[PDB]
Amino acid sequence: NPIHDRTSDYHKYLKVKQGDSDLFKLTVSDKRYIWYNPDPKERDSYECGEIVSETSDSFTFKTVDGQDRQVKKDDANQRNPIKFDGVEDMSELSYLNEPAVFHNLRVRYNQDLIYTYSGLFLVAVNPFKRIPIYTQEMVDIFKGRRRNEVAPHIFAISDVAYRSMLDDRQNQSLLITGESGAGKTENTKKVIQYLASVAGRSGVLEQQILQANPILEAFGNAKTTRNNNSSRFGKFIEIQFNSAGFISGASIQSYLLEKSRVVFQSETERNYHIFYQLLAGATAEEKKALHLAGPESFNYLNQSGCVDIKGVSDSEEFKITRQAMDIVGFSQEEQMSIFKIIAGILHLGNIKFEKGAGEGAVLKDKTALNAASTVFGVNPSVLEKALMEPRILAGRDLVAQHLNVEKSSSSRDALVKALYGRLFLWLVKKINNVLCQERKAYFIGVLDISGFEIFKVNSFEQLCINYTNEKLQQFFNHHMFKLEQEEYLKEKINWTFIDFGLDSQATIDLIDGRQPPGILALLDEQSVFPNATDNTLITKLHSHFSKKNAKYEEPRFSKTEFGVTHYAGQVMYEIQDWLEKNKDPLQQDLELCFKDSSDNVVTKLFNDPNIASRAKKGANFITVAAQYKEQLASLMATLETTNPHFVRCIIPNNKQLPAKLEDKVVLDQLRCNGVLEGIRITRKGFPNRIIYADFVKRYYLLAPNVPRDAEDSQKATDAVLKHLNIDPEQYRFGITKIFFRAG
Template structure:
């Protein structure tokens, strides 16, 4: 995104690429030939192509705190955005606007003063942009828009794992329950349920990954519903693309979902379900990481139980939920060995038999029927039913499929519904927390689905940002009809190119729901378990398998999400992880630049550059560039007319005059600054010349006065000395 038509000259301040820091400040020392010679801060001189340089404003660098809105940067470009974030982050100013988009850089330290009740009071009803950038400001503007326009809103929170998406989502919900809460003394159950849904969803949907100890392994869209008075009346949670494979397969040093470890540390409850240390269970001991630093599984278990109480899950259902989790753990310990018949299998030993019996007891179903669903399949033909035996590998796959299906339904069907919905609500604010774009050394089917979702959301983001640009032009009443932004890229590489390993795509895309599993658990004597498996349609009983493509189902979910988002007014928060070691006050330029690209922040800059990226109020413009046309400054022209006169004098064409601002095409501010620098340089030389002349004249006068005084002294001395000498 270089500034076109930038007139580089000797002494100009620029940004130059650096393989370690992405960009570094430099100054042009020679601009002859096709390459430009620049000197960087270390004193080193390098050669660079002019099209690889970005202009920078040295005056802005003297403002060590940076600017709170990227659109205030004189040069809206990639290095300018990066270093502005760096300057603000050094002062713990973790929030920065890019127009109406909020960038949140994870501080990796507690900043309680930013999120107390006093701070929420400050932002309540404050015009957007009047106070410092904050997540509360975005939440407040969405709430006010909902109340004033009667239209549902959405807040889209994105970023890579560890960037702070989940915490940001919780802060948004905290603020919305503050402004949409009931008066003191009223029943505040609904707001409490909304807030307590967070630790509940984290327990069942979050896990430790290589990058993050509390990583969300599913996308969620929390819909907070409001009544006509702006009070919270209910909430609903929709989940997307749960990482089902984690239930049965993990690698060191990652963990399974938090709830399993909490249950194993629950004391009497763990004893009741015949549980013990996580190392005793196959679904947990594939990794040797059982605990998180600074986290007590037992205490977290009690927090989860308290959250269930507040959300409204009865004690009977709580028991059923944890009994189901225990059943999954026991199920994972069932092993198989080859049977007497060809390609058949049986339970391996007494230990496996014990765990099978425990799983059946906890599911409240017949153990023999459960066994039959694991190592046999019933195939329906025209002549009748055929029972097919499964070999050991197929039986293990069947076991794991049952565990994944039960867990997914537990999370989606029960945890979502329990929050409670208001069927009479007409407006809502949806908060989307979805994992960001992923590009690893090895990328598989999961990354493909995640990145496909991010591409769609990025496309939505681009369209909305361009719409905001047009709205600004309409508001300022400038001619924008000819401004075009054409998005003609394939969805495959809208953000960046990724190479996928397709070896396991087909297997991971197959999500067979075994009808025998569903029929068995639908007949469970536990109403809770039976409720997870409603009676299947009649046609599904014709086959032992009901095929459901993961990609197809995810695409349908994504389509529904996009339809919801398109019916709302969106607001965007881009979370950024400043370093890979999760340490405060550490800013890794290359990593952050990658996130800014993937998160669409630089795409927003690109869209802005397609129109009029530089905009200044008339007073700001005249204050800075009035010296380019001093002959007009003492006239009766108003600031708008003065701005026009200055631009006309310089023969600039690519600008628009709005109601309160002047809009400049990319590169025009560079021309103005270059001319301003020339005028200031000439003025400085004149001043220096006059000053040198003045100083030389003063020295001459002083010398002459001193000479006259010396002459007078000498004459006086000689007048006395000579007569005395002669006598």
């Protein structure tokens, strides 16, 4: 058994290395230590100082530079005995404080142990390098093990969820939190791998489930300045099981694709990988048939200054993506149409509108228009008229507009974004049709959202993302602190309620409240108001929240920005284009143009109502904000019907580098994630609890005769446990349940 064989890969890569005799000497030392700040203005940079004396209320300690300092005992962060360094479950620490928690993570991370428990949930620190802990042998090691039998691992929490699903016949969820780049998607994929392995069975479903990801990532992920493989859409993967616990299928709900990225990318960022994959990987006359050149020739790829990612071959990736499409079952014609659409988008991007004789735009060169039309299979004259002279109603009259250059470019971009988003939707739908063949008995849902992120310029997309991340942190807060203590108090176990000081509700209400209206509601209102501008909008927000809502800031340094205080920090948002992004317009004549496409996939994108149609609320189409919010509330409703398991991914630094665990970066994450509070609730509270009658059947007794049944439930439990003479401090008696602190 490799768990017990210290030469095994398990021991080498998942367990803390054996300390030496010098270490042993240090470990049995009577000396005592404190974590202190050499510079009190840098509260996250700590060193270890030896405690050399104490009074009744203070410690005096030597700093590393031999100088003595004094601190009140109430302000002291004592260092744990070094036998705890590297401990697998931090609820075991004697001293639960910030530098002590960070230090334990640091000791593990320096030995490449990225996973650490903090009571009931998992912490994961991104290594930014490959560590060989995800092989099939590692998988197999976790299968069937109680949590405490094996080292912390994403596989272990995965197994716990699976067994919880079986034992309680209750749906589960795996909620992976983290800022952008923290490791959410990699861990999500490890979860799916584990489940596909342990619950797997004909055998191609599991392969198809796994092969969904290169497709989704090629179309839905991109390089940002924070992550070379940033997910620009959120997703909820329901892994589905039959009554027997075998995988019977899976279904992916996707959220909120950053469609603006198709048409615009910041300096050093990339568009979606697929564009580069196609241009790099396509056959010699694939490229001739689609009129393609290199990325530098396309406006939608040549603006950021970056066409490459270190360590990535877009050609090789293209081969992997196509292979995935083969396994999932997209036909050759379907794939060809997909690439026609990607190529058509690049050509649309190359169209250059110019000022005509009047204010209205003209197209002097039709090479890009013609190439797009050719690959999309639409009529180029109809497309041209639809771009620069779309028809609208004025009352009931029919009026041709004549859009200027700017409006023309915007409309072309709107068309591009609509194409990309519908195509993305279609890919997801096609995928689901293949993975969903049977009605489920159970599910384990795995959530992989786009993570909390902050740039120089934060827009409506950042607000939606950061909102979602705030809702997810609140969900953790609700389950860990609020509901837990509600159980204690309903079971009257003598608990004094503790205010853990973590509540995101005010920020959430600020963003999505109804009465009084929050940001999104005022946004929606401005979005259906004919005279509205980005300026009437920002003014309206300041009018409602400035000096009124504690989580909002009207900045003095700007007239187009507003600040929201999130759990993870203040973010300033630029209001430019919010009305247009929220309304998400597309000229009907462009839809009519593409409805007439000769291409089987394109027509589906424009005629299939699940893809093409948009809901109404009154005389208006549903805004993006109201729809996403409907979607999110729906997700949270589903999660609330599940048993949640939390994984908190922690980014070590902001440089995407291995072996560089930065103090302030990590401590900021630990603080706003509520890690220490969670560890604390696990320790001060009563993690384990059981109805007075379902206890009889795991064991038997050690008592004067309470069998698998009894007339009594309360004293019938009292008696049986009592014999071990284990401390009644380690348990309590609820109206219906026995509670316990540590098993």
